[PDB]
Write a protein that binds this ligand. Structure first.
Ligand SMILES: O=C(O)CNC(=O)c1nc(Cl)c2ccccc2c1O
Ligand SMILES: [Mn+2]
Length: 220
């Protein structure tokens, strides 16, 4: 599907209505599997961190999600860069229709690997203090994921709503949601290796004034 039809007929109305939007089969099996291959290659060659220290004898320490930051131009990351370009194309075609936000900037990609040792990620808000991030975009890479046996569901707790939104981390699934306090969320314990790629998109105004908050030119 062209970035434009998805954006205009699904992503814009869904984000303005629900603030949580899922696109399945975003890039297709061939491209999705190549991205999976690149991510697994990064993992197998030690490009990830050792993992979030979950509990602290140091040999018995439990570590959780591993991460690596990817620009998309690195050797062996070109298909990740293609994913990032595709995300950018969608956001570009949503211009002026997501909230009243103006998006002209993003982060690098954060590739995350939950190692499958029963660790997850605690309930949190991505941007609770106004750092400029307005949309969280996550792409999942896990073929034939069965949450009934592997866990790893993303559970979102939409504000003002007495309800859960449970999202399985399915292969070739793209997810968008508002990054601020509207969408507290958690990753339930994962019992199999679980990969995802996240990009955050900035609202230009919030980012500009965030620079005032968290602050140079020489004076002679
Ligand atoms: O992977 C998922 O479905 C959802 N993950 C997250 O919400 C998530 N959020 C943050 Cl802020 C971090 C932050 C650092 C490392 C991993 C994260 C993560 O997986
Ligand atoms: Mn998060």
């Amino acid at each position: 599907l062209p970035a434009l039809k998805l954006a205009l007929e699904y992503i814009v109305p869904c984000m303005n209505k629900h603030g949580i939007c899922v696109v399945d089969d975003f890039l297709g099996k061939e491209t999705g599997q190549q991205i999976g291959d690149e991510v697994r290659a990064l993992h197998d060659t030690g490009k990830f961190t050792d993992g979030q220290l979950v509990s602290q004898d140091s040999s018995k320490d439990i570590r959780g999600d591993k991460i690596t930051w990817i620009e998309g131009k690195e050797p062996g990351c070109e298909t990740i860069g293609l994913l990032m370009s595709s995300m950018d194309d969608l956001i570009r075609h949503c211009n002026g229709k997501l909230g009243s936000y103006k998006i002209n900037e993003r982060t690098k990609a954060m590739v995350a690997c939950y190692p499958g040792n029963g660790t997850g990620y605690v309930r949190h808000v991505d941007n609770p203090n106004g750092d400029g991030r307005c949309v969280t975009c996550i792409y999942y890479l896990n073929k034939d994921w069965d949450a009934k046996v592997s866990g790893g569901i993303l559970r979102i707790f939409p504000e003002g709503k007495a309800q859960f939104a449970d999202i399985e981390p399915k292969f070739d699934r793209l997810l968008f949601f508002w990054s601020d306090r509207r969408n507290p969320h958690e990753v339930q314990p994962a019992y199999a290796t679980r990969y995802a790629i996240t990009v955050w998109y900035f609202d230009a105004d919030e980012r500009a004034r965030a620079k005032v908050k968290y602050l140079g030119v020489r004076v002679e």
